[PDB]
């Protein structure tokens, strides 16, 4: 069934999915520094408390880059869900920058570094709560882009 | 056999997808290398200069290098094995160099931080191995892209 036109659909849905999964991986990098590198460079181990002011700045850079790549996402079909992650990335980046009072210093404590970018422990006052539904908003976007690719492939085998 | 071409397409789809995960992880290390080395959050612009304190930014980048080595280990493809094992070794060598130079890498000097995890620097003694697995993934990323294209190429043939 219209094999030459389907290949364009499959390729188009591929590019959209790839661009979302790239934003996905940037989020997973923000997660890895949160649960593996917060307050911890050594011969063994690959403990040092209360000094993460740099690690916070690097993760702020990733969050900006996440917004830039989201602005480059243009697909008239996924427009509903793209703008959701669009403004979700905005409230996140703004939140860390909104209060530099505990994030724009060299010695940010563990309970504050775990607070802004670690979505695991209990306290999520200023920070990781906004990281929370930014991840979830990309989950929605990633699933939709996956299903659009599957539906394009599904068009091949139709009777 | 349109069903068999379907599996060839979606299979090389997943490999390219998993390879681009390693690719995007590297762009994060690249982004924290060119936009957050020696830095902290500001109000108006978002980031302002903060010299000589990057002992956690390097610790952050180390976990991604560990995460990169993890994803490269999970890659299983008999057609891409050559380029897969080339990136695994370059991933092992990189994380090994960061742990080998722990004397000068709290608060690593921006001269050392730019030297250790930044591609665009002259010296690159503590970075040189960040280019040889970036380009190794580049070669890996191009091969997976062409494998997907070749699968779609089979769809339209006489």
């Amino acid at each position, epitope marked *: 069934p219209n094999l030459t036109e389907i290949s364009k659909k499959i390729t188009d849905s591929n590019a959209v999915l790839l661009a979302v999964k790239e934003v996905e991986a940037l989020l997973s990098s923000i997660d890895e520094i949160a649960a593996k590198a917060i307050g911890k460079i050594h011969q063994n181990n690959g403990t040092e408390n209360n000094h993460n002011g740099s690690l916070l700045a690097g993760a702020y850079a990733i969050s900006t880059l996440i917004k830039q790549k989201l602005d480059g996402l243009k697909n008239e*079909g996924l427009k509903e869900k793209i703008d959701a992650a669009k403004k979700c990335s905005e409230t996140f980046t703004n939140k860390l920058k909104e209060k530099h009072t505990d994030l724009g210093k060299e010695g940010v404590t563990d309970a504050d570094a775990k607070e802004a970018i670690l979505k695991t422990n209990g306290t999520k006052t200023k920070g990781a709560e906004e990281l929370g539904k930014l991840f979830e908003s990309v989950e*929605v976007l990633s*699933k*939709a882009a*996956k*299903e659009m*690719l*599957a*539906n394009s*492939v*599904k068009e091949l*085998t*139709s*009777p | *056999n349109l*069903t*068999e071409i*379907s*599996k060839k397409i*979606t299979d090389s*789809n*997943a490999v390219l997808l998993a390879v681009k995960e390693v690719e995007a992880l590297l762009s994060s290390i690249d982004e924290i290398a060119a936009k957050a080395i020696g830095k902290k959050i500001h109000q108006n612009n978002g980031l302002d200069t903060e010299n000589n304190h990057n002992g956690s930014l390097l610790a952050g980048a180390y976990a991604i290098s560990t995460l990169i080595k993890q994803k490269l280990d999970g890659l299983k493809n008999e057609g891409l094995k050559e380029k897969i094992d080339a990136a695994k070794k370059c991933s092992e060598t990189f994380t090994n160099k960061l742990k080998e130079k722990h004397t000068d890498l709290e608060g690593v000097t921006d001269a050392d931080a730019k030297e250790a995890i930044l591609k665009t620097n002259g010296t690159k003694t503590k970075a040189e191995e960040l280019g040889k697995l970036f380009e190794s993934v580049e070669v890996l990323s191009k091969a997976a892209k062409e494998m997907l294209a070749n699968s779609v190429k089979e769809l339209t043939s006489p």
Partner: antibody, heavy 123, light 107 residues
């Protein structure tokens, strides 16, 4: 959390029209996934009837295409099934089911089902 | 495409090992699934993509096969494992099911 429940009259006269509705909770049919109707006569196997995706694309079983139609009410998060000109062969337990990509990218697999309702075609 | 699975009835004891074969008529690739159905209950998906376990399905279930011949294996059969089993192709609609195999406990 994903739950599906069928409903509708369970008795339909021969040559009449079957009407069933599937109510979805814990999930939104407008955001993704395919949603289908599945048939199982007493003591026999399973037969897929039709499916739809929120984009509007719907597919029907070629053995029933002439008699089957599936409608969607996204505002109520429900979808329905209609089967006209029914005979005793249409007596079956009717399921509504969701299909998902799971850990793959193709095809969709039925991973959620309703409890099913028995519809009897008899005079 | 038609799916014929065999045997129609299996009889085995708790702890035994059974294998069910699903035969496709012209080629499926690996787009095959295995379902478990207890009387009065909706079918429960066990394995998809013809070897992949669904979440929660125990390791004693295993599937294999590509293209035409598929096999479901239950090593060390448990009391809760006695049910009716269907195979289903997912490569194209109408997503044909097998006519089913019902394995009862031998005593």
């Amino acid at each position: 959390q994903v739950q599906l429940q069928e409903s509708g009259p369970g008795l339909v006269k021969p040559s009449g029209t079957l009407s069933l509705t599937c109510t979805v909770s814990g999930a939104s049919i407008s955001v993704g996934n395919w949603w289908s109707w599945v048939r199982q006569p007493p003591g026999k196997g399973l037969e897929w009837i039709g499916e739809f995706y929120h984009s509007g694309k719907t597919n029907y079983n070629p053995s029933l295409k002439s008699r089957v139609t599936i409608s969607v009410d996204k505002s109520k998060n429900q979808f329905s099934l209609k089967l006209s000109s029914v005979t005793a062969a249409d007596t079956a337990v009717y399921y509504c089911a969701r299909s998902d990509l799971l850990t793959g990218y193709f095809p969709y697999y039925f991973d959620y089902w309703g409890q099913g309702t028995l519809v009897t075609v008899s005079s | 495409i038609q799916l014929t699975q065999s045997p129609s009835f299996l009889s085995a004891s708790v702890g035994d090992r059974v294998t069910i074969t699903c035969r496709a008529s012209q080629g499926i690739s690996s787009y095959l699934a295995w379902y478990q159905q207890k009387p009065g209950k909706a079918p429960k998906l066990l394995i998809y993509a013809a070897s992949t376990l669904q979440s929660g399905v125990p390791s004693r279930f295993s599937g294999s096969g590509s293209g035409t011949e598929f096999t479901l294996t239950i090593s060390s059969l448990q009391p809760e494992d006695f049910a009716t089993y269907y195979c289903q192709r997912l490569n194209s609609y109408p997503y044909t099911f097998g006519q089913g195999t019902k394995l009862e406990i031998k005593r």
